[PDB]
Ligand binder design. Structure first.
Ligand SMILES: [Zn+2]
Length: 206
């Protein structure tokens, strides 16, 4: 019932689909690569499928709950996640302890539709101290990991202003924050995300 990790063959449709979503969603960030480093491309080392029967059942139960609360619209999206606690997430799921961070859109679990936005969170807020080994936010050596996740958004609060908020208004299951304007997706319950794919990669020096 615990986690099984399956290495995907680069010739597999799933590997190719995930790598292409990861590469195609790279953007040039407003910070000129301060947080996540300077790159236009990833070198994908491997992609692992994450199979956890218990996490999947709880995700499916929560999605049905959210669907019923939002006129049968669970609004599932495939979104990227970066976190220093990725290793814990694939084994134990999104734990509101340590999966939660702060940001412009309040405390919660942060996802992005752009892989390069999630890359800014891999080593912590604003890239933290960068890679453990070289303390380098733009390390081209160290292997990074990010997740590509199934995320139940239900009813989203759309935030567009650069205003610090604590939490979404009542009756909302997520925030979509857009302060260019790359969208960040915040959820408040760990069971609203399933870590489908573990991507091991390097950022490439242009
Ligand atoms: Zn490094």
């Amino acid at each position: 019932q615990g986690t099984i990790l399956l290495d995907l063959a680069p010739e597999d449709k799933e590997y190719q689909s995930v790598e292409e979503e990861m590469q195609s969603t790279i953007r040039e960030h407003r910070d000129g690569g301060n947080a996540g480093g300077i790159f236009n491309r990833y070198n994908v080392i491997r992609i692992q499928k994450v199979v956890n029967k218990k996490l999947r059942e709880r995700f499916c139960h929560r999605q049905k709950e959210v669907s019923e609360e939002n006129h049968n619209h669970h609004n599932e999206r495939m979104l990227f996640h970066g976190s220093p606690f990725i290793n814990a997430i694939i084994h134990k799921g999104f734990d509101e302890r340590h999966a939660y961070i702060g940001g412009m859109f309040g405390a919660g679990i942060y996802f992005a539709e752009n892989s390069s936005k999630s890359n800014q969170y891999v080593y912590g807020i604003g890239g933290g101290t960068g890679c453990p080994t070289h303390k380098d936010r733009s390390c081209y050596i160290c292997h990074r990991q990010m997740l590509f996740c199934r995320v139940t958004l239900g009813k989203s609060f759309l935030q567009f202003s650069t205003m610090k908020m604590a939490h979404a208004p009542p009756g909302h299951h997520s925030v979509i924050g857009r302060p260019l304007a790359y969208a960040e997706y915040v959820i408040y319950r760990g069971e609203q995300a399933y870590p489908e794919y573990l991507i091991t990669y390097q950022i490439m020096k242009p």
